[PDB]
Design an enzyme around this catalytic site. Sequence first.
Site, PDB file in Angstrom:
ATOM      1  N   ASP A 128       0.823  -1.219   0.000  1.00  0.00           N
ATOM      2  CA  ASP A 128       0.000   0.000   0.000  1.00  0.00           C
ATOM      3  C   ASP A 128       0.865   1.280   0.000  1.00  0.00           C
ATOM      4  N   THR A 134      -7.030   3.296  -2.227  1.00  0.00           N
ATOM      5  CA  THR A 134      -6.679   1.896  -1.983  1.00  0.00           C
ATOM      6  C   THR A 134      -7.694   0.832  -2.502  1.00  0.00           C
ATOM      7  N   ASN A 172     -13.344   5.648  -1.781  1.00  0.00           N
ATOM      8  CA  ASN A 172     -13.244   5.118  -0.420  1.00  0.00           C
ATOM      9  C   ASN A 172     -14.543   5.341   0.361  1.00  0.00           C
ATOM     10  N   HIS A 217      -0.913   2.434  -5.427  1.00  0.00           N
ATOM     11  CA  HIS A 217      -0.848   3.892  -5.757  1.00  0.00           C
ATOM     12  C   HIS A 217       0.378   4.431  -5.049  1.00  0.00           C
ATOM     13  N   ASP A 261     -20.776   9.876 -27.741  1.00  0.00           N
ATOM     14  CA  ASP A 261     -20.933   9.105 -26.498  1.00  0.00           C
ATOM     15  C   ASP A 261     -21.887   9.861 -25.561  1.00  0.00           C
ATOM     16  N   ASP A 305     -20.728   6.034 -21.560  1.00  0.00           N
ATOM     17  CA  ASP A 305     -20.335   4.666 -21.158  1.00  0.00           C
ATOM     18  C   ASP A 305     -18.993   4.229 -21.777  1.00  0.00           C
ATOM     19  N   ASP A 357     -22.022   5.146 -29.572  1.00  0.00           N
ATOM     20  CA  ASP A 357     -23.494   5.185 -29.610  1.00  0.00           C
ATOM     21  C   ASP A 357     -24.063   4.625 -30.914  1.00  0.00           C
TER      22      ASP A 357
HETATM   23  C1  LIG Z   1     -15.077  -2.671 -19.318  1.00  0.00           C
HETATM   24  O1  LIG Z   1     -15.352  -4.083 -19.278  1.00  0.00           O
HETATM   25  C2  LIG Z   1     -16.661  -4.405 -18.852  1.00  0.00           C
HETATM   26  C3  LIG Z   1     -16.851  -5.918 -18.724  1.00  0.00           C
HETATM   27  O2  LIG Z   1     -16.687  -6.493 -20.024  1.00  0.00           O
HETATM   28  C4  LIG Z   1     -17.712  -3.783 -19.804  1.00  0.00           C
HETATM   29  O3  LIG Z   1     -18.922  -3.779 -19.066  1.00  0.00           O
HETATM   30  C5  LIG Z   1     -19.946  -4.601 -19.632  1.00  0.00           C
HETATM   31  O4  LIG Z   1     -20.608  -3.891 -20.653  1.00  0.00           O
HETATM   32  C6  LIG Z   1     -21.649  -4.614 -21.315  1.00  0.00           C
HETATM   33  C7  LIG Z   1     -22.280  -3.760 -22.427  1.00  0.00           C
HETATM   34  O5  LIG Z   1     -22.731  -2.501 -21.926  1.00  0.00           O
HETATM   35  C8  LIG Z   1     -22.721  -5.075 -20.309  1.00  0.00           C
HETATM   36  O6  LIG Z   1     -23.655  -5.897 -21.008  1.00  0.00           O
HETATM   37  C9  LIG Z   1     -25.028  -5.710 -20.542  1.00  0.00           C
HETATM   38  O7  LIG Z   1     -25.317  -6.632 -19.495  1.00  0.00           O
HETATM   39  C10 LIG Z   1     -26.600  -6.565 -18.907  1.00  0.00           C
HETATM   40  C11 LIG Z   1     -26.637  -7.603 -17.787  1.00  0.00           C
HETATM   41  O8  LIG Z   1     -25.752  -7.143 -16.788  1.00  0.00           O
HETATM   42  C12 LIG Z   1     -25.685  -8.004 -15.622  1.00  0.00           C
HETATM   43  O9  LIG Z   1     -24.889  -9.182 -15.786  1.00  0.00           O
HETATM   44  C13 LIG Z   1     -23.476  -9.004 -15.901  1.00  0.00           C
HETATM   45  C14 LIG Z   1     -22.791 -10.342 -16.214  1.00  0.00           C
HETATM   46  O10 LIG Z   1     -22.829 -11.249 -15.125  1.00  0.00           O
HETATM   47  C15 LIG Z   1     -22.946  -8.289 -14.645  1.00  0.00           C
HETATM   48  O11 LIG Z   1     -21.548  -8.104 -14.697  1.00  0.00           O
HETATM   49  C16 LIG Z   1     -23.674  -6.943 -14.486  1.00  0.00           C
HETATM   50  O12 LIG Z   1     -23.202  -6.241 -13.349  1.00  0.00           O
HETATM   51  C17 LIG Z   1     -23.428  -4.808 -13.433  1.00  0.00           C
HETATM   52  O13 LIG Z   1     -24.562  -4.343 -12.701  1.00  0.00           O
HETATM   53  C18 LIG Z   1     -24.532  -4.395 -11.271  1.00  0.00           C
HETATM   54  C19 LIG Z   1     -25.440  -3.287 -10.746  1.00  0.00           C
HETATM   55  O14 LIG Z   1     -26.779  -3.632 -10.984  1.00  0.00           O
HETATM   56  C20 LIG Z   1     -23.159  -4.164 -10.613  1.00  0.00           C
HETATM   57  O15 LIG Z   1     -23.041  -4.883  -9.397  1.00  0.00           O
HETATM   58  C21 LIG Z   1     -21.935  -4.443 -11.500  1.00  0.00           C
HETATM   59  O16 LIG Z   1     -20.847  -3.732 -10.950  1.00  0.00           O
HETATM   60  C22 LIG Z   1     -22.175  -4.050 -12.969  1.00  0.00           C
HETATM   61  O17 LIG Z   1     -22.373  -2.641 -13.068  1.00  0.00           O
HETATM   62  C23 LIG Z   1     -21.813  -1.981 -14.229  1.00  0.00           C
HETATM   63  O18 LIG Z   1     -22.473  -2.288 -15.467  1.00  0.00           O
HETATM   64  C24 LIG Z   1     -23.821  -1.793 -15.625  1.00  0.00           C
HETATM   65  C25 LIG Z   1     -24.432  -2.178 -16.986  1.00  0.00           C
HETATM   66  O19 LIG Z   1     -24.603  -3.577 -17.094  1.00  0.00           O
HETATM   67  C26 LIG Z   1     -23.880  -0.270 -15.403  1.00  0.00           C
HETATM   68  O20 LIG Z   1     -25.211   0.197 -15.443  1.00  0.00           O
HETATM   69  C27 LIG Z   1     -23.232   0.114 -14.074  1.00  0.00           C
HETATM   70  O21 LIG Z   1     -23.093   1.510 -14.003  1.00  0.00           O
HETATM   71  C28 LIG Z   1     -21.825  -0.469 -13.931  1.00  0.00           C
HETATM   72  O22 LIG Z   1     -20.998   0.273 -14.804  1.00  0.00           O
HETATM   73  C29 LIG Z   1     -25.195  -7.182 -14.416  1.00  0.00           C
HETATM   74  O23 LIG Z   1     -25.522  -7.812 -13.192  1.00  0.00           O
HETATM   75  C30 LIG Z   1     -27.683  -6.786 -19.966  1.00  0.00           C
HETATM   76  O24 LIG Z   1     -28.929  -6.570 -19.356  1.00  0.00           O
HETATM   77  C31 LIG Z   1     -27.516  -5.824 -21.159  1.00  0.00           C
HETATM   78  O25 LIG Z   1     -28.494  -6.106 -22.175  1.00  0.00           O
HETATM   79  C32 LIG Z   1     -29.267  -4.933 -22.602  1.00  0.00           C
HETATM   80  O26 LIG Z   1     -28.698  -4.249 -23.723  1.00  0.00           O
HETATM   81  C33 LIG Z   1     -28.684  -5.107 -24.871  1.00  0.00           C
HETATM   82  C34 LIG Z   1     -27.687  -4.694 -25.961  1.00  0.00           C
HETATM   83  O27 LIG Z   1     -27.074  -5.870 -26.454  1.00  0.00           O
HETATM   84  C35 LIG Z   1     -30.110  -5.293 -25.394  1.00  0.00           C
HETATM   85  O28 LIG Z   1     -30.113  -6.106 -26.547  1.00  0.00           O
HETATM   86  C36 LIG Z   1     -30.959  -5.943 -24.299  1.00  0.00           C
HETATM   87  O29 LIG Z   1     -32.311  -5.838 -24.699  1.00  0.00           O
HETATM   88  C37 LIG Z   1     -30.748  -5.275 -22.923  1.00  0.00           C
HETATM   89  O30 LIG Z   1     -31.508  -4.081 -22.935  1.00  0.00           O
HETATM   90  C38 LIG Z   1     -32.593  -4.126 -21.986  1.00  0.00           C
HETATM   91  O31 LIG Z   1     -32.296  -3.381 -20.813  1.00  0.00           O
HETATM   92  C39 LIG Z   1     -32.074  -1.994 -21.053  1.00  0.00           C
HETATM   93  C40 LIG Z   1     -31.532  -1.323 -19.787  1.00  0.00           C
HETATM   94  O32 LIG Z   1     -32.288  -1.721 -18.658  1.00  0.00           O
HETATM   95  C41 LIG Z   1     -33.359  -1.349 -21.602  1.00  0.00           C
HETATM   96  O33 LIG Z   1     -33.144   0.004 -21.937  1.00  0.00           O
HETATM   97  C42 LIG Z   1     -33.856  -2.098 -22.852  1.00  0.00           C
HETATM   98  O34 LIG Z   1     -35.103  -1.568 -23.277  1.00  0.00           O
HETATM   99  C43 LIG Z   1     -33.896  -3.631 -22.643  1.00  0.00           C
HETATM  100  O35 LIG Z   1     -35.016  -4.040 -21.871  1.00  0.00           O
HETATM  101  C44 LIG Z   1     -26.057  -5.843 -21.681  1.00  0.00           C
HETATM  102  O36 LIG Z   1     -25.790  -7.024 -22.417  1.00  0.00           O
HETATM  103  C45 LIG Z   1     -22.088  -5.773 -19.089  1.00  0.00           C
HETATM  104  O37 LIG Z   1     -23.045  -5.942 -18.060  1.00  0.00           O
HETATM  105  C46 LIG Z   1     -20.911  -4.991 -18.498  1.00  0.00           C
HETATM  106  N1  LIG Z   1     -20.223  -5.746 -17.434  1.00  0.00           N
HETATM  107  C47 LIG Z   1     -19.704  -5.204 -16.314  1.00  0.00           C
HETATM  108  C48 LIG Z   1     -19.018  -6.130 -15.312  1.00  0.00           C
HETATM  109  O38 LIG Z   1     -19.747  -3.992 -16.058  1.00  0.00           O
HETATM  110  C49 LIG Z   1     -17.407  -2.321 -20.121  1.00  0.00           C
HETATM  111  O39 LIG Z   1     -18.229  -1.920 -21.210  1.00  0.00           O
HETATM  112  C50 LIG Z   1     -15.915  -2.062 -20.428  1.00  0.00           C
HETATM  113  N2  LIG Z   1     -15.664  -0.639 -20.574  1.00  0.00           N
HETATM  114  C51 LIG Z   1     -15.114  -0.095 -21.680  1.00  0.00           C
HETATM  115  C52 LIG Z   1     -14.954   1.409 -21.730  1.00  0.00           C
HETATM  116  O40 LIG Z   1     -14.725  -0.756 -22.644  1.00  0.00           O
HETATM  117 CA   LIG Z   2     -22.069   5.354 -25.644  1.00  0.00          CA
HETATM  118 CL   LIG Z   3     -13.184   8.824  -2.270  1.00  0.00          CL
HETATM  119 ZN   LIG Z   4      -3.496   5.939   2.110  1.00  0.00          ZN
END
Ligand SMILES: *[C@@H]1O[C@H](CO)[C@@H](O[C@@H]2O[C@H](CO)[C@@H](O[C@@H]3O[C@H](CO[C@H]4O[C@H](CO)[C@@H](O)[C@H](O[C@H]5O[C@H](CO)[C@@H](O)[C@H](O)[C@@H]5O[C@H]5O[C@H](CO)[C@@H](O)[C@H](O)[C@@H]5O)[C@@H]4O)[C@@H](O)[C@H](O[C@H]4O[C@H](CO)[C@@H](O)[C@H](O)[C@@H]4O[C@H]4O[C@H](CO)[C@@H](O)[C@H](O)[C@@H]4O)[C@@H]3O)[C@H](O)[C@H]2NC(C)=O)[C@H](O)[C@H]1NC(C)=O
Ligand SMILES: [Ca+2]
Ligand SMILES: [Cl-]
Ligand SMILES: [Zn+2]
Length: 802
Positions: A121, A159, A180, A309, A680, A684, A688
């Site tokens: 750390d 951290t 944090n 860090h 964008d 995200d 788009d």
């Molecule tokens: C960095 O790498 C990561 C990992 O590869 C990339 O993130 C991925 O991006 C994917 C595309 O955006 C995304 O895929 C979606 O998954 C949805 C299901 O998600 C759940 O399951 C996964 C897998 O187990 C899980 O990891 C998810 O966990 C998220 O959510 C919880 C909170 O509820 C958190 O605990 C967790 O930390 C994580 O949060 C993060 O991601 C979410 C988005 O998923 C953000 O909102 C948070 O802010 C946070 O950043 C979930 O538990 C699935 O539902 C999606 O499908 C929709 O879209 C498709 C398009 O193909 C569409 O066809 C479907 O119809 C569906 O749309 C429907 O829902 C819409 C919204 O409600 C609605 O508008 C429509 O009308 C439809 O009804 C989609 O496939 C994937 O989940 C994340 N994974 C992670 C770990 O974040 C990331 O992109 C990379 N970054 C870069 C810059 O490259």
């Molecule tokens: Ca976007």
């Molecule tokens: Cl903080």
């Molecule tokens: Zn510290």
Amino acid sequence: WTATSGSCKGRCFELQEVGPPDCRCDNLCKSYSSCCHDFDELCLKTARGWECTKDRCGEVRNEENACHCSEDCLSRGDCCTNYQVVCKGESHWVDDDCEEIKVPECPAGFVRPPLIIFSVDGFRASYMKKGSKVMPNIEKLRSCGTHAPYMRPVYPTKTFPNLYTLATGLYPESHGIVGNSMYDPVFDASFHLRGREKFNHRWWGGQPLWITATKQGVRAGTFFWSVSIPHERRILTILQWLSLPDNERPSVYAFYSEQPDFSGHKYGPFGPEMTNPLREIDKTVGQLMDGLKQLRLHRCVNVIFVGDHGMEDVTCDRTEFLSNYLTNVDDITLVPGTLGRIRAKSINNSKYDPKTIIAALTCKKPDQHFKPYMKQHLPKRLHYANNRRIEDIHLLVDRRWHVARKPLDVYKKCFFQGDHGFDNKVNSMQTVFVGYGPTFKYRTKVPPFENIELYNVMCDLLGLKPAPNNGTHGSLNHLLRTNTFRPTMPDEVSRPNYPGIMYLQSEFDLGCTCDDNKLEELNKRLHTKGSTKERHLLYGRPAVLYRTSYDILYHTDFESGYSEIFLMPLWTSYTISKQAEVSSIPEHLTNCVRPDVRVSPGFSQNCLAYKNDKQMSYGFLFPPYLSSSPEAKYDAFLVTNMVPMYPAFKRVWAYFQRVLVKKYASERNGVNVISGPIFDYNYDGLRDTEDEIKQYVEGSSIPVPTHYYSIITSCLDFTQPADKCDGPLSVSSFILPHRPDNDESCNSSEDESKWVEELMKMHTARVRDIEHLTGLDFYRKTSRSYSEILTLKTYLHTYESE
Ligand SMILES: *[C@@H]1O[C@H](CO)[C@@H](O[C@@H]2O[C@H](CO)[C@@H](O[C@@H]3O[C@H](CO[C@H]4O[C@H](CO)[C@@H](O)[C@H](O[C@H]5O[C@H](CO)[C@@H](O)[C@H](O)[C@@H]5O[C@H]5O[C@H](CO)[C@@H](O)[C@H](O)[C@@H]5O)[C@@H]4O)[C@@H](O)[C@H](O[C@H]4O[C@H](CO)[C@@H](O)[C@H](O)[C@@H]4O[C@H]4O[C@H](CO)[C@@H](O)[C@H](O)[C@@H]4O)[C@@H]3O)[C@H](O)[C@H]2NC(C)=O)[C@H](O)[C@H]1NC(C)=O
Ligand SMILES: [Ca+2]
Ligand SMILES: [Cl-]
Ligand SMILES: [Zn+2]
Ligand SMILES: Cn1c(COc2ccc(C#N)cc2NC(=O)C(C)(C)C)n[nH]c1=O
Ligand code: NA
Ligand code: NA
């Protein structure tokens, strides 16, 4: 309630956690007040200390002792780490010459070399040089193994966000640990360092290494150690686990040290009090390596020495107070310190306005030590916006400073001399990486890289398939002797059209106007067929990795991929040699826009929409200033080279195109430039679709970009010109926000030479960031290996000094 009256007999540091109210014997038990009554007595023995001595050699086993010097200790796996040195005439690991480890040299029954993650750390990158005299064990790992000059953390440089990024390969916005301290509005719950809520599973997204391992049948030791378990006992426990039978023995392990961070907060990063914590860390490494050697595992285990860090000089008097800017200070909640996050104190208050808060915090004092942002306007390289736990209003705090709400918060809550949490480009926040073992290279220095890359490599080291993450798998293959991951280029999804001349001038009604030989006509036709394309497209055309409709357009000075859906190029490519000359736009061509007879009126922009739209003007992607001849210059005014630009943004773009591109070509010996729009609107970090666009040029279907990118490539050996380069490449890129004002730049009323380049440096980017944002894949046709190209695509030019 725990019936804490079971026993830890035989169970000390049990790998599987028992379901309460049965009492616990694991590291987490302390944090839950759930340890069995006899946990301390049996599991945290201390009698006689931590080292063997001359008179202890060959002793009769006494189970009360912290560690053992008896004859049977090796078979039991519980000797003090210096046992063989003191009692068997062995040498310390640090005094042995290093010798290349060409193959793993492991005891029978080991199916793979184990991995040990040694995490420290607050271990600032410059401690490796500056503390080298007092860290002999670490310096041996560093010089004999594979090391980087530093490793880039994620933002914020705190951290928990960084350790969980190491574990998952994810940006904090995707894993959910964004600070944090946090408020989640859906849960209506708060997360804090002190307390119980942080143990709830709903905070922690993605899939960390220990879960990845378990799901694929690989056993993991503890990643978490209770603060009161001393470091010597953590090391002995790991060494004990490594002595378990084959079916019970973990393959991956973690050690954690609270130092040097704990002391760095109190004394500053280079306080004289800092020498001792660095000595103590080195002694711990020495104990691990001596222990591995005794077990004949020192040429078998891969060891990663990694920080979360660095640490900067920060004191109480360097605090800005929001009470010096705002009148309504009690109507806000601030998350304070080395970053700021602001939300409304009460959701029932409909008179709270984020716009007027931002404005009251913008460029108000001549040396202001923070800058306010809507989160979607933060530099895209930070990847810090796509999470409901990140407040809309953000303050990027200058290094060496803090922000607080009111002065009372500081003197009723100078203690500290160090802190961290700033922008992850800052030199003082950089941290360390060393890999040592059979799977890493021997005596090898590699370039700096980002901690988001390591999860993939730790999966490679353990034969695991990584969960989806933000690393670029293959970009760190050059760290490894073997176990490389051999990726393939993504397949192109849409092939281009190659339109010829298909429309007559009079078919266009766009409201555009412009004031406009057999030798010189065969010439212009060949240019439009792609005769100069080898000059302007050096690395092949970008591949389009989504379904869409687009055309390749050739010209004397540039080539473009023109989207019929978005009505503008997705990309424009051109080469400017060292010898190139800048010209001006002649007077008769000032407002010239020309129809493109290869592209239908229906798939074209029109000048009338820009006339009608009082806020929006237009720019060009290939700059008319850099045309090769007065006749080639006409190509630059095609309606197919035009893009929408706010007049405030045109100040930026015009300076980049007129001054900076020529400057880079002179300094770098020619450059190849690829520029284009980015959309964008949902912040995200991903391209788009057309149904996501929130703004259009008034009364048209011309979509307005949120950002403009450029990728600027040349030869790493700058004695070779960009267009005739035989070896590795060099790149810098940026993603500039397309803003209707320059409020971000406090000096913007001055000449562009005083503020534009500074803005561009702030918005520096990796090629990979641009790939995510556009759905394009660059460098498809080079003479370089794909792994080398992946490393190039993850490079970030930071503009920090040494
Ligand atoms: C960095 O790498 C990561 C990992 O590869 C990339 O993130 C991925 O991006 C994917 C595309 O955006 C995304 O895929 C979606 O998954 C949805 C299901 O998600 C759940 O399951 C996964 C897998 O187990 C899980 O990891 C998810 O966990 C998220 O959510 C919880 C909170 O509820 C958190 O605990 C967790 O930390 C994580 O949060 C993060 O991601 C979410 C988005 O998923 C953000 O909102 C948070 O802010 C946070 O950043 C979930 O538990 C699935 O539902 C999606 O499908 C929709 O879209 C498709 C398009 O193909 C569409 O066809 C479907 O119809 C569906 O749309 C429907 O829902 C819409 C919204 O409600 C609605 O508008 C429509 O009308 C439809 O009804 C989609 O496939 C994937 O989940 C994340 N994974 C992670 C770990 O974040 C990331 O992109 C990379 N970054 C870069 C810059 O490259
Ligand atoms: Ca976007
Ligand atoms: Cl903080
Ligand atoms: Zn510290
Ligand atoms: C911080 N800490 C620790 C060591 O924690 C770690 C060491 C290495 C890795 C990796 N890869 C991850 C963690 N932790 C995490 O990822 C958290 C965020 C779940 C805590 N022990 N005690 C203590 O206070
Ligand atoms: Na206009
Ligand atoms: Na300004």
